[PDB]
Amino acid sequence: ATVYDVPGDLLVERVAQRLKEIPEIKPPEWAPFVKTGRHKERLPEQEDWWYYRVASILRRVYLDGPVGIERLRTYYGGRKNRGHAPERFYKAGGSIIRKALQQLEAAGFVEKVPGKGRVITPKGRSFLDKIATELKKELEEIIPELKKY
Amino acid sequence: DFRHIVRVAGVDLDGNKQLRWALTAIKGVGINFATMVCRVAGLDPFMKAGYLTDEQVKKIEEILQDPVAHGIPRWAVNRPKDYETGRDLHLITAKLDMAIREDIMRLRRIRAYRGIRHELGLPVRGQRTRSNFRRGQTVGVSR
Amino acid sequence: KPLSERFFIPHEIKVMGRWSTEDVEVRDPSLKPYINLEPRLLPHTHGRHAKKHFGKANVHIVERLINKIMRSGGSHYKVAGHFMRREHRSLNSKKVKAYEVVKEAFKIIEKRTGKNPIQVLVWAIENAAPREDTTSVMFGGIRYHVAVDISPMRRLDVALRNIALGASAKCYRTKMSFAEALAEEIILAANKDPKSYAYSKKLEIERIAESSR
Amino acid sequence: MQKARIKLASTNVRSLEEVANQIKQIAERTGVRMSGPIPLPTKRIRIVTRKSPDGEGSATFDRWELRIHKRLIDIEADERAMRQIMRIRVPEDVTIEIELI
Amino acid sequence: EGYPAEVIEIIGRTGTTGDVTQVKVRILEGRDKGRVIRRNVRGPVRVGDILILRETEREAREIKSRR
Amino acid sequence: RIIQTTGKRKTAIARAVIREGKGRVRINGKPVELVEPEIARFTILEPLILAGEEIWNSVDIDVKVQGGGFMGQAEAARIAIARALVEWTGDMNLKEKFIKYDRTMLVGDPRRTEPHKPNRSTKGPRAKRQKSYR
Amino acid sequence: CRDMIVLPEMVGLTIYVHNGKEFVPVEIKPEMIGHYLGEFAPTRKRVQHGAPGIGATRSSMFVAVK
RNA sequence: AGUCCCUCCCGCUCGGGAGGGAGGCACUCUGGGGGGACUGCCGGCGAUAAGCCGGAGGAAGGGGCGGGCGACGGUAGGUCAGUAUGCCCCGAAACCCCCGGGCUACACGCGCGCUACAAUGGGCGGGACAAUGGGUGCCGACCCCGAAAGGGGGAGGUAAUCCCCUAAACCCGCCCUCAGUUCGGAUCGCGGGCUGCAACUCGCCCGCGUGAAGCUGGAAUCCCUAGUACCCGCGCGUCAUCAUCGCGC
Ligand SMILES: [Mg+2]
Ligand SMILES: [Mg+2]
Ligand SMILES: [Mg+2]
Ligand SMILES: [Mg+2]
Ligand SMILES: [Mg+2]
C-alpha cells in the first residue's frame, strides 16, 4: 500500500516517531524561543514540536511534487485574532521551513529541481510507503473492510 | 515532598497550578516569557508547582535576574537598550513601575507633546475624541 | 473516540446505522399520521419540504428534532429568566455539530433507561403537547380572550420546540454539557415530572386556557 | 506548414462571424486543412457607479458593461492562401493579428 | 379527558387577525359518538383530521354567513 | 466494457467510471471507507447499500470531483454513482427503489445561489440595514 | 521646519519654531536629542468648556425653532 | 477515460499505485445555432363565458426564478461646491502661485457598526474542500539571508498559457473545568521596519511587558417567506502607503 491508503494524522504521528533517529534532523539553536507564524499567540506546547513539522513536510512534498518555499507558507498560515477588529488570513514565517527543507535535503529524501522547487527521491518513497504498509497491516483488524485493497 | 505555597522574588505563587501559569502572576513575566525560562532552566512547564524543590528556586531566581546571559535572547526582553546604558535588561515587579514612572517624568520635564497628555490624563497615541473616551459625568440643560 | 467507532461502516438500512424503528408504537390517534418513522438511514433532506403546503408531514422525526436545535436560544423572548443571545458561538448553520450532539444524546438515553431511544422520544413528545389554547376574536366591535382547540400539526411543533428550549437552558453558563442536558430533559418529560420545562409549560398553558372558557 | 495562427477579437458578434466564414471558405476553396474557429472566453469589463450628482436621496446605482468576443484559427501556410487572406478587408471594429509557429 | 373527533368540512377563517378556523367535527367515542357540532381551531387543518377536545359541548358561535 | 456518468451540485462536478472488480470504490484516490465527516460518508453509501451486498461486490467505481465543499461534493458523488449503477445492472426493479427513497438521486438539484442587491450587498439579496427614525 | 531632528550641535542654544501664527522659543537642553523640533511648540489652545446650548439635547431642539 | 512505450515505489508481485511522452476530443469546459411549457391533458367550481382549485407526465408548471426599462404631472424637495448659465457685487482684489497651521480640538446628547460578557468554549499539534475578479508606472513563481515585520537576487507574463491563489467556519488528539478565569484585550513603556520631497501635531506594520469596563441588557424598536434569514472567509473600488466602509463572490 501507499500513503494514499490511510488518514493523514495517523501516518504523520507514526512517521515523526521513526524520524527521531536520523542524525541530520535535529532542532536548531532557537527552537525553544519561537512561535510558528505571525498569526499565533503562544509558543508550541510539546517538546518535540520539530519532528512533527518535518514529518508533515515530507508527506507534503510526496503528494505535491515540485513545491516551493513561498507555497509552503500559504499552507501553514491561519486566521488572526487582532483585537477589536475583524479576523483575517496571514502567511507564516520562513526560517522554520527553510531549515526543514535543507535538513531533508542533506538527509537524502528530497532534492532541488532547478527553477521549479523541490521533489521527492526514490529513497523518500521507500521510506514513506514502508511505514504506510506497516501501519495498515493493523488498521484492517479493527476495520475488516480494508482487507480488499 | 509536596507543598501548597511557594515564593520567588516577592509575589508568592500557587502550588496546584502548572509551573508556566504559576509564574504568570509575577508582574513582569507574561506567558510567553514563562515558557522560555522554564525551558532554559531545565524542567518541564507541566509539573505541579508544589513539586519545586528549593535549589530549583535558586536557579529560577538566578535566571530572572539577568536572563540574557543564560540563553534568553535580547529580542525577547522587558526593555532593550536601556536609556541610561545600552545594556539589555529585564525588570520585575518593584523595579518595573518605577522605570516607567521615570520614563514618564523625563517627558514631563522637557514639556513635550507626549508629556502634557500624560499630565492631563487624555489619550496619547493619536485617537479621536468627539465621540468616545467619555470618562466624565453627564451635563443637563433644562426640563 | 475508539478507532472502531470513529470508523464505522453499516451494512443495514437502519437509523444512523444503529437503531431500528420497526417496533415503536404511537398511542395518540391524533399524532399518528404526522410522526413519520420510515427507514431513512441518514437524517438530512436538504430543505426541500419547506416549499409545499403540508410538506413537513413526510419528514423523519429525527430530522425534525435535529433541525430544532440549530439555533442560538431565546433572542427576543426570555426563557426561564433571561435572554440568551449567544451570537458567533451558536450553532445556527452547523448541522454537523447538531447531528453529533443528538447522537451522543441517544447514546446516553439508551444507557440510563434501556429502551430504543426513539420510543422514549415518542413518549416525550406526547406528554408535552397540549390541546387547548387561547386567542382574541373580535365580534361586532369588540374582542375578548376565548379558548380554542389546537390542530395536531401545531401540537407537534410546539412539543418539539419546548423540548429544545428546555435542554438549551440548563447548559447555559453551567457545568453540565449540552448532550447530557438533552437527556435530563427527555427522561423527565417522558415520566411526567414537574422539574421539567416542556411539561410545566404544557400545564401552565392548559391552566390559563381552561380558566377562561 | 509553420501553422500560422490568427486571432480575431471584436465587440459586435455578428461582424465577426462573417470574416470567420470568409477565412473558412478561402481555406476550403484551395487545398489546405484548418481548425475551425475555437471560441475563447468572453472578457466583459464592468463599471459600477452612483447615480446622483449631489448626496441627497437614497443610493441607487448603475451597471455599465462592455463585452469583447474572441476567436482563434489555426491554418497552414500556402502562398496561394497566405496571400488569399490578405485582401480580406476586415471591418473597422475588428482586430486581426497573424503569426506563425 | 380523551374525546377525539374527526373533521369533515371547513367553514372559514374567524379571528381578530385571521388566526382561527371554524370547522364542523363529528365525535367518535363517548357520550355522543355520532353527533355533529361546530368548533374553532388554531393552526392548520385538512379534512379527515382527528382533533382531541375536552368538553364535547360548546358549539362555537355562528360565523358571518361564512363570508 | 466501461461506462461513465456525471453529476453536478451547485459548482461541483463528478466524473465516474464503472467496471468489473472486487467491490472497491475510490474517490479522488481516497477509499470510501475513510471519509472523516461521517455525515458526508453516509451520504455516498446510500446507493451502494440500497442495492445490496451482492451487486456491491461485482463492480469498481472511481470518481473525481472539484469545487464546492465537503457536503456539496458528497452529493455529486452520490448522483453519479446512482446513475452508473442504474446502467451496469440495467434493470428497473432497482431503478424504482431509487425513486421511493429519494427522487433526486437521478434528477439532481436545479438550485443555485442568487445574486446580491444594493442595500448591504455583502450579506445577501434581501437583508438590509436598520431603519432610523428620530 | 518643525521636522528637524535635534542634534548634539544644537544643545545649549535657543532656537525658534513656527506654531502657525508666531515663533515660539524652545530653549534646547540635553534629553531632547532624538525628539522632533516641532514636538515642543504646541499648536492648539487648551480647551475649557462653557455650557450646552440650544440643540445639545433632544429637549431643546424643536422647543426653540417654533 | 480506454489503448502504447520508458522510469520509480509497496506485502517482493501474481496484483496496486505515481510521473513523464506519443496520440484523442470520449467526459468536464468554453460559445455560436436550434429544441423544450401552451392552462396543452384528465377531475371539480364558476354560466356553458372570463377565469380559479386539485392530479398526472415532466429537468422544470401555472408572469418558469432573479434582474433592466419609472407614463401625464406634482413635490417653490436636493444640487450654481461636476460641467453649461442670466442678474448683482471683487477687478491689482473675493483673481493666480508658494511655505507653515486647521478640517484629526472635547464636561456632553444622538444615528449606524465591530469586539465580547465564555464550555452551543479558549490554547497547542496535525487533516479537508471554493468562486467572482485583477496585473506593463504593474503582477512576482524559484533560490538565498532574518525569530517576525521585511531585505538582496530574479525566470515567466501585453493573458483559458505565467502570477495574485494549498481560504475560514469543519474534523481528530492532548491541556483548562465554571472562575472576573488559560474568559475579555481596551489603555500605556521600550526596541525593530515599509511607503514618502516630508511621519511631532496626524500614517501603517512587528516583538516583550501592564491587563479597564464587561456575568445576557428598563420602557421601546428593526430586518427577513427558500438555496432566502443566520454563521464564516475572499475579490475589486478609493490607493505612493492605510478598510471595522461601498459593490460583488
Ligand atoms: Mg426646487
Ligand atoms: Mg427650497
Ligand atoms: Mg470631517
Ligand atoms: Mg485570551
Ligand atoms: Mg505621526
Q: What is the CATH number of the domain that holds D70?
A: 3.30.70.600
φ, ψ of residue A131 in degrees (nearest 5): -70, -35
Within F 75-94, residues with CB less than 7 Å from strand H: none
Question: Could you give the dihedral angle defined by the CA atoms of residues B49, B50, B51 and B57, in that order, rounded to the nearest 10 degrees?
Answer: 70
C140 Ramachandran zone, left/alpha/beta (phi>0; psi -120 to 50): left
What is the dihedral sign for C-alpha G5, G7, B114, B32?
positive
Q: Residue C63: name the closest of C16, C104, C20 by CA.
A: C16
Other Cβ atoms within 10 Å of C31 Cβ, number: 20
Number of domains comprising chain B: 2
CB contact at 8 A, F82 and F47 = yes
Q: To which H or E segment does residue D42 belong?
A: strand D40-49
Cβ neighbours for C98, distance < 8 A, ≥ 6 positions apart = C66, C67, C69, C70, C91
CA D20 to chain centre: 9
Provide the domain limits for residue D32: 1-101
Other Cβ atoms within 10 Å of B96 Cβ, number: 15
| Secondary structure letter of residue E62 according to DSSP | P
Exposed / middle / buried, residue A122 (Cβ in 10 Å: 0-12, 13-18, 19+): exposed
Exposure b/e, D50-89, CB count within 10 A at least 16 = b = eeeeeeeeeeeeeeeeeeebbbebebbeeeebbebbeeee
CB contact at 8 A, F31 and A146 = yes
Q: In whole angstroms, give the CA distance from residue F103 to residue E42.
A: 34
Cβ neighbours for D16, distance < 8 A, ≥ 6 positions apart = D8, D10, D69, D71, D94
Instruction: Read off the amino acid at residue E26.
Output: R
The CATH H-level superfamily of C1-213 is: Ribosomal protein S7/S5 (1.10.455.10)
D9 Ramachandran zone, left/alpha/beta (phi>0; psi -120 to 50): beta
Q: Using the CA of A57, give the nucleotide whose C1' is nearest.
A: H126
C96–F49: do the CB atoms touch at under 8 Å? no
DSSP track, F57-88: GS-EEEEEEESS-TTTTHHHHHHHHHHHHHHH
**Boundary-marking domain end, from B57, B73, B89:** B73
DSSP track, F1-35: --EEEEEESSS-EEEEEEE-SSS-EEETTEETT--
What are the residues facing E40 on neighbouring strands? E22
CB contact at 8 A, F76 and F14 = yes
What is the dihedral sign for C-alpha F66, F71, F74, F79?
negative
Q: In whole angstroms, give the CA distance from residue D27 to residue D76.
A: 9
CB contact at 8 A, C98 and C90 = no
All 3 cell numbers of residue F67? 469545487
Other Cβ atoms within 10 Å of B80 Cβ, number: 14
Instruction: Read off the amino acid at residue C62.
Output: V
Residues in F closer than 8 angstroms to C9, CB to CB, are 33, 45
E9-13/D98-99 β-pairing: unpaired
Widest pairwise Cα distance in chain F: 75
Exposure b/e, F10-47, CB count within 10 A at least 16 = b = eebbbebebeeeebbbebeeebbbbbeebbbbbbbbbb
Cα within 13 Å of Cα(C41), Cβ side: 21
E36-42/C145-150 β-pairing: parallel
Structural domain spans, chain F: 1-134
Helix (H, G, I), strand (E, B) or coil at A130: helix
CB contact at 8 A, C36 and F40 = no
- The angle at the Cα of F131, spanning F128 to F134, to the nearest 5 degrees, equals 165
Interface of F with A (CB under 8 A): 22-24, 29-31, 33-34, 36
Q: In whole angstroms, give the CA distance from residue F70 to residue C111.
A: 33
Mutate to test the interface with C, among A5, A6, A143, A148 (most CBs of C within 10 A): A143
C154–E46: do the CB atoms touch at under 8 Å? no
Number of domains comprising chain E: 1
How far CA C143 is from CA of B86, C136, E17, E20, F89, in Å, comes to 86, 6, 11, 14, 67
Q: In whole angstroms, give the CA distance from residue F28 to residue F36.
A: 14
All 3 cell numbers of residue F47? 446507493
Tell me how far the alpha carbon of residue F118 lies from the centroid of ligand 1, in angstroms: 28
How far CA A47 is from CA of A17, A37, A86, in Å, comes to 13, 18, 33
φ, ψ of residue F8 in degrees (nearest 5): -120, 140
CB contact at 8 A, B141 and B130 = no
All 3 cell numbers of residue B105? 517624568
**Boundary-marking domain end, from B73, B92, B127:** B73
Give chain F's length: 134
Q: In whole angstroms, give the CA distance from residue C160 to residue C121.
A: 10
Provide the domain limits for residue B122: 74-143
All 3 cell numbers of residue B58? 535558586
The Å distance, CA of F35 to C1' of H241, is 47
Experimental technique, in short, is: cryo-EM
> Looking at domain F1-134, which of 3.90.1300.10, 2.60.120.10, 3.30.230.10, 3.40.50.720 is its CATH number?
3.30.230.10
CB contact at 8 A, F17 and A142 = no
Closest residue by Cα to the C1' atom of nucleotide H155?
A115
The Å distance, CA of C100 to C1' of H216, is 27
Long-range contacts of G51-60 (CB under 8 A, 24+ apart): G51/B139, G52/B139, G52/B140, G52/B141, G53/B141, G56/B139, G56/B141, G57/B140, G57/B141, G59/B141, G59/B142, G59/B143, G60/B141, G60/B142
**Residue appearing with cell numbers 469589463:** D45
Instruction: Read off the amino acid at residue C68.
Output: K
CB contact at 8 A, A119 and A66 = yes
Cβ neighbours for G24, distance < 8 A, ≥ 6 positions apart = G16, G17, G18, G41
Instruction: Read off the amino acid at residue F2.
Output: I
Q: In whole angstroms, give the CA distance from residue F48 to residue F54.
A: 10
Q: To which H or E segment does residue A103 belong?
A: helix A95-107
Please indicate, yes or no, whether residues B19 and B64 belong to a single structural domain of this protein: yes
Q: In whole angstroms, give the CA distance from residue G32 to residue B75.
A: 26
Q: In whole angstroms, give the CA distance from residue B99 to residue F109.
A: 69
What is the dihedral sign for C-alpha C115, C117, C122, C125?
positive
Residues in B closer than 8 angstroms to A36, CB to CB, are none
Structural domain spans, chain A: 1-149
Q: In whole angstroms, give the CA distance from residue C33 to residue A56.
A: 55
Cβ–Cβ contact G25 with B under 8 A:
no
Angle, to 10 degrees, between the axis of helix C198-210 and the axis of helix C152-167? 130
